[PDB]
Subunit: 115 residues, 4 copies
């Protein structure tokens, strides 16, 4: 599990459950190729997106469908989605956690990169 | 104006207006002595808390009354307040902006510290 | 000035100066068309990106070039940029401030949306 | 485990390891009584602070010694510590996670409250 996504809800103080997450890899021609996707669990986590063999160095985009999340809760949001764009580097540690903390007009995101 | 406080609401995407703020300074006996207080304006800003003369070196606590803010809007929040505790003016006078971004179960705070 | 961008540095406690910002607007064919660009000033603010006339309804992407910022300061950061994607002016003209707070492996962004 | 503390480092993109954390309970006379304390683990977590029987309703303060953390890494910080002050309410869900994301001149904190 080299890539994990964790999503929290700052309005309810809870994991953000059943949020759609799409990961893309940047192709040679600067387009975004679908790579992996899923929905966050009851604990706000999405595991099993990729494998060590598939997750090569490159630029990746993690798109979190925040707009749909907020609308399903009956709350009016600002963003279309949250985007996290980063380079995977084999020099760095091997496990990437992308965390995001959501509010209707704001979000925070951090990377936890460990061995 | 060497100490300013700015507060935003992350639910509304607006300034957080009418937020009460209490500033304390640690006394010689290591208790928290009341130093200044005020409330944020329509722009979410609180100016005029103190003066260059009065804002001496010390350890200061800026308490932002987030629970009262949210309750006044009919919301039950998690935190009692947001506390920002820092040493000021240890290398000479500086200007401090304490910014805070509020959600019902979360907040962020940052400091912008300028000149010398 | 209907679109403004403000960027802070959470490591230094200062405005993030000379941050490049590129704004795109989604075209009829659903590609991202370049709309405006600029860089933050000494105050960490970017004004004058667009005009009320030009800033029509649409889906906009504000790309803040955080990697170039950090690399220019001799730091290797995590993200390529911070992207802020939103629908604008769907209920008539509004003024948008996009704020971002930067750390080498993290950022926060919020929107302040005002009048009608 | 009704109370857990998790601390992350936004400069290095890592858990915040060996951070001192002190929890206090507000007494009848408005003073802060020591309640529990510890140091975060290699995963930036502090488990086992209290038990269900001990963690009664009331106002609690979680003090995270951010200044010492940053100084041990050779980095100059702004805050003396980070403080998180909240009421424990038996009406709400039963497990509290206090999370904090640290930078030298900023921090974020959120509560994840679940059953
Ligand atoms: N100093 C002003 C501009 C300015 C606007 C805002 I609005 C602000 O407030 C926040 C609050 C949070 I919370 C953030 O995450 C961020 I980014 C900015 C700050 I500080 C400065 C000038 O004179 O130009
Ligand atoms: O298991 C976990 C529990 C909580 C967290 C919190 C992450 C987090 C991310 C942010 O961008 C801001 C913040 O205040 C917190 C991460 C992992």
């Amino acid at each position: 599990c080299p890539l994990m996504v964790k999503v929290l809800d700052a309005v309810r103080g809870s994991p953000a459950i059943n949020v759609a997450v799409h990961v893309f890899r940047k192709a040679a021609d600067d387009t975004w190729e679908p790579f992996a996707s899923g929905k966050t669990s009851e604990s706000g986590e999405l595991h099993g997106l990729t494998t060590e063999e598939e997750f090569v160095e490159g630029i990746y985009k993690v798109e979190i469908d925040t707009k749909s999340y907020w609308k399903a809760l009956g709350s009016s949001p600002f963003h279309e989605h949250a985007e996290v764009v980063f380079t995977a580097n084999d020099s760095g540690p091997r496990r990437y956690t992308i965390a995001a903390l959501l509010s209707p007009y704001s979000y925070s995101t951090t990377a936890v990169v460990t061995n």
